[PDB]
Write a protein that holds these residues in place. Structure first.
Motif, PDB file in Angstrom:
ATOM      1  N   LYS A 178     -44.012  24.130  -5.498  1.00  0.00           N
ATOM      2  CA  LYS A 178     -45.051  25.561  -5.638  1.00  0.00           C
ATOM      3  C   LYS A 178     -44.913  26.243  -6.898  1.00  0.00           C
ATOM      4  CE  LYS A 178     -44.522  28.780  -2.451  1.00  0.00           C
ATOM      5  NZ  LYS A 178     -44.487  29.188  -1.036  1.00  0.00           N
ATOM      6  N   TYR A 179     -43.639  26.479  -7.544  1.00  0.00           N
ATOM      7  CA  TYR A 179     -43.376  27.314  -8.474  1.00  0.00           C
ATOM      8  C   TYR A 179     -43.353  26.270  -9.868  1.00  0.00           C
ATOM      9  CZ  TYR A 179     -42.535  30.457  -4.702  1.00  0.00           C
ATOM     10  OH  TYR A 179     -42.660  31.502  -3.545  1.00  0.00           O
ATOM     11  N   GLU A 180     -43.663  25.305 -10.029  1.00  0.00           N
ATOM     12  CA  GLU A 180     -43.413  24.324 -11.120  1.00  0.00           C
ATOM     13  C   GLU A 180     -44.069  24.629 -12.301  1.00  0.00           C
ATOM     14  OE1 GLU A 180     -44.624  19.455 -12.013  1.00  0.00           O
ATOM     15  OE2 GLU A 180     -44.208  19.964 -10.029  1.00  0.00           O
ATOM     16  N   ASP A 181     -45.315  25.413 -12.503  1.00  0.00           N
ATOM     17  CA  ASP A 181     -45.879  25.914 -13.443  1.00  0.00           C
ATOM     18  C   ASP A 181     -45.096  27.119 -14.192  1.00  0.00           C
ATOM     19  OD1 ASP A 181     -47.871  24.066 -13.191  1.00  0.00           O
ATOM     20  OD2 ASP A 181     -49.095  25.104 -12.256  1.00  0.00           O
ATOM     21  N   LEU A 182     -44.607  27.978 -13.230  1.00  0.00           N
ATOM     22  CA  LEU A 182     -43.622  29.018 -13.539  1.00  0.00           C
ATOM     23  C   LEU A 182     -42.648  28.579 -14.105  1.00  0.00           C
ATOM     24  CD1 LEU A 182     -44.775  31.594 -10.899  1.00  0.00           C
ATOM     25  CD2 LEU A 182     -45.365  31.929 -13.091  1.00  0.00           C
ATOM     26  N   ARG A 183     -42.010  27.491 -13.568  1.00  0.00           N
ATOM     27  CA  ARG A 183     -40.679  27.067 -14.136  1.00  0.00           C
ATOM     28  C   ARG A 183     -40.827  26.622 -15.233  1.00  0.00           C
ATOM     29  NH1 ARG A 183     -36.243  23.788 -14.348  1.00  0.00           N
ATOM     30  NH2 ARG A 183     -34.339  24.886 -13.208  1.00  0.00           N
ATOM     31  N   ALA A 184     -41.899  25.789 -15.659  1.00  0.00           N
ATOM     32  CA  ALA A 184     -42.134  25.095 -16.803  1.00  0.00           C
ATOM     33  C   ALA A 184     -42.354  25.839 -18.013  1.00  0.00           C
ATOM     34  CB  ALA A 184     -43.091  24.109 -16.662  1.00  0.00           C
ATOM     35  N   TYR A 185     -43.307  27.088 -17.806  1.00  0.00           N
ATOM     36  CA  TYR A 185     -43.837  28.058 -18.789  1.00  0.00           C
ATOM     37  C   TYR A 185     -42.377  28.867 -19.271  1.00  0.00           C
ATOM     38  CZ  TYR A 185     -45.815  31.671 -21.247  1.00  0.00           C
ATOM     39  OH  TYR A 185     -46.337  32.849 -22.251  1.00  0.00           O
ATOM     40  N   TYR A 186     -41.509  29.441 -18.359  1.00  0.00           N
ATOM     41  CA  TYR A 186     -40.503  30.316 -18.590  1.00  0.00           C
ATOM     42  C   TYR A 186     -39.103  29.563 -18.869  1.00  0.00           C
ATOM     43  CZ  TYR A 186     -43.398  34.563 -17.144  1.00  0.00           C
ATOM     44  OH  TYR A 186     -44.137  35.307 -17.274  1.00  0.00           O
ATOM     45  N   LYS A 205     -36.151  33.443 -17.778  1.00  0.00           N
ATOM     46  CA  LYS A 205     -35.448  32.256 -18.163  1.00  0.00           C
ATOM     47  C   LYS A 205     -34.163  32.317 -17.681  1.00  0.00           C
ATOM     48  CE  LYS A 205     -36.147  29.818 -22.182  1.00  0.00           C
ATOM     49  NZ  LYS A 205     -36.028  29.637 -23.703  1.00  0.00           N
ATOM     50  N   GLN A 206     -33.418  33.453 -17.979  1.00  0.00           N
ATOM     51  CA  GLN A 206     -32.174  33.779 -17.415  1.00  0.00           C
ATOM     52  C   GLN A 206     -31.914  33.566 -15.943  1.00  0.00           C
ATOM     53  OE1 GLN A 206     -29.861  36.768 -20.056  1.00  0.00           O
ATOM     54  NE2 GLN A 206     -29.518  37.680 -18.022  1.00  0.00           N
ATOM     55  N   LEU A 207     -33.131  34.117 -15.281  1.00  0.00           N
ATOM     56  CA  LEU A 207     -32.976  34.130 -13.859  1.00  0.00           C
ATOM     57  C   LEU A 207     -33.270  32.348 -13.529  1.00  0.00           C
ATOM     58  CD1 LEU A 207     -35.102  36.983 -13.151  1.00  0.00           C
ATOM     59  CD2 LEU A 207     -32.622  36.744 -12.576  1.00  0.00           C
ATOM     60  N   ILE A 208     -34.056  31.938 -14.063  1.00  0.00           N
ATOM     61  CA  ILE A 208     -33.968  30.317 -13.962  1.00  0.00           C
ATOM     62  C   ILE A 208     -32.725  29.546 -14.077  1.00  0.00           C
ATOM     63  CG2 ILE A 208     -35.342  28.216 -14.439  1.00  0.00           C
ATOM     64  CD1 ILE A 208     -37.698  30.103 -15.292  1.00  0.00           C
ATOM     65  N   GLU A 209     -32.232  29.866 -15.223  1.00  0.00           N
ATOM     66  CA  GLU A 209     -31.029  29.271 -15.477  1.00  0.00           C
ATOM     67  C   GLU A 209     -29.659  29.659 -14.588  1.00  0.00           C
ATOM     68  OE1 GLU A 209     -30.576  29.860 -19.721  1.00  0.00           O
ATOM     69  OE2 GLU A 209     -31.999  28.547 -20.324  1.00  0.00           O
ATOM     70  N   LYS A 210     -29.755  31.020 -14.354  1.00  0.00           N
ATOM     71  CA  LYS A 210     -28.473  31.223 -13.781  1.00  0.00           C
ATOM     72  C   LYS A 210     -28.560  31.726 -12.168  1.00  0.00           C
ATOM     73  CE  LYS A 210     -25.849  33.742 -17.338  1.00  0.00           C
ATOM     74  NZ  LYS A 210     -25.861  32.544 -18.253  1.00  0.00           N
ATOM     75  N   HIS A 211     -29.900  31.763 -11.607  1.00  0.00           N
ATOM     76  CA  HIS A 211     -30.200  32.173 -10.182  1.00  0.00           C
ATOM     77  C   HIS A 211     -30.999  31.033  -9.565  1.00  0.00           C
ATOM     78  CE1 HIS A 211     -27.504  35.729 -10.408  1.00  0.00           C
ATOM     79  NE2 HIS A 211     -27.910  35.764 -11.660  1.00  0.00           N
ATOM     80  N   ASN A 212     -31.525  30.031 -10.493  1.00  0.00           N
ATOM     81  CA  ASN A 212     -32.453  29.175  -9.797  1.00  0.00           C
ATOM     82  C   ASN A 212     -33.835  29.640  -9.120  1.00  0.00           C
ATOM     83  OD1 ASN A 212     -33.106  26.207  -9.198  1.00  0.00           O
ATOM     84  ND2 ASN A 212     -32.461  26.891  -7.061  1.00  0.00           N
ATOM     85  N   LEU A 213     -34.107  30.699  -9.956  1.00  0.00           N
ATOM     86  CA  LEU A 213     -35.665  31.145  -9.867  1.00  0.00           C
ATOM     87  C   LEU A 213     -36.565  29.952 -10.176  1.00  0.00           C
ATOM     88  CD1 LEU A 213     -37.425  33.441  -9.348  1.00  0.00           C
ATOM     89  CD2 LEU A 213     -37.329  33.994 -11.736  1.00  0.00           C
TER      90      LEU A 213
END
Ligand SMILES: [Cl-]
Ligand SMILES: [Cl-]
Ligand SMILES: [Cl-]
Length: 190
Positions: free
Chosen positions: A1-9, A133-141
């Protein structure tokens, strides 16, 4: 579901200071500022308040925060927004970043860190992108959870809110704020 956001950020970003911005013959209906920190010409779209702000230039002493957009149907690589005036003096304005997260099991966790603001004038683009980006890396956003807010809280009580379930609106990538008037930053993931 959140693959586009994760890729962009999780795209790489590039930052340059004290650049010389110039305008060329336009190649679309959106106008662009160009900077050449090295030998690559970065093209930065002028959207939102930037359309009014910059005319023909050139414009010296600008800082740029760059993220190259995906656009299958344009060969030229470009970024959007993220232009600020360069510092007049050095800034080290440390603010609290608090992170509250309610995971897919409804468990609420709270964490904290500090986030160093080094710019007198900073784009919402840069704050939005680096924080996500920090949230994706550290908190698995954008792993299991992909909704909620980033709130930049200002000293006059004002708020700039980034809703996590979608990309930052394009026009807001040109919005710039006083980095030293940031009181704190609050993240709420759900
Ligand atoms: Cl974080
Ligand atoms: Cl303020
Ligand atoms: Cl603004």
């Amino acid at each position: 579901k959140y693959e586009d956001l994760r890729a962009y950020y999780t795209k790489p970003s590039f930052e340059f200071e004290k650049q010389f911005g110039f305008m060329l013959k336009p190649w679309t209906t959106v106008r662009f500022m160009n900077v050449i920190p090295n030998r690559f010409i970065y093209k930065i779209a002028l959207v939102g308040k930037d359309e009014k702000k910059y005319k023909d230039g050139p414009y010296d002493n600008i800082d740029v925060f760059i993220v190259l957009e995906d656009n299958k149907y344009q060969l030229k690589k470009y970024s959007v927004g993220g232009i600020t005036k360069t510092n007049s003096k050095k800034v080290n304005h440390k603010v609290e970043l608090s992170i509250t997260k309610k995971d897919n099991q409804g468990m609420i966790s709270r964490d904290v860190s500090e986030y160093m603001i080094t710019k007198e004038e900073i784009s919402l683009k840069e704050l939005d992108f680096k924080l996500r980006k920090q949230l994706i890396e550290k908190h698995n956003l954008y792993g299991n959870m992909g909704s909620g807010t980033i709130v930049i809280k200002m000293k006059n009580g004002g708020k700039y809110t980034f809703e996590l379930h979608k990309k930052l609106q394009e026009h807001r990538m040109a919005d710039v704020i006083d980095g030293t008037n940031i009181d704190n930053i609050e993240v709420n993931i759900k």
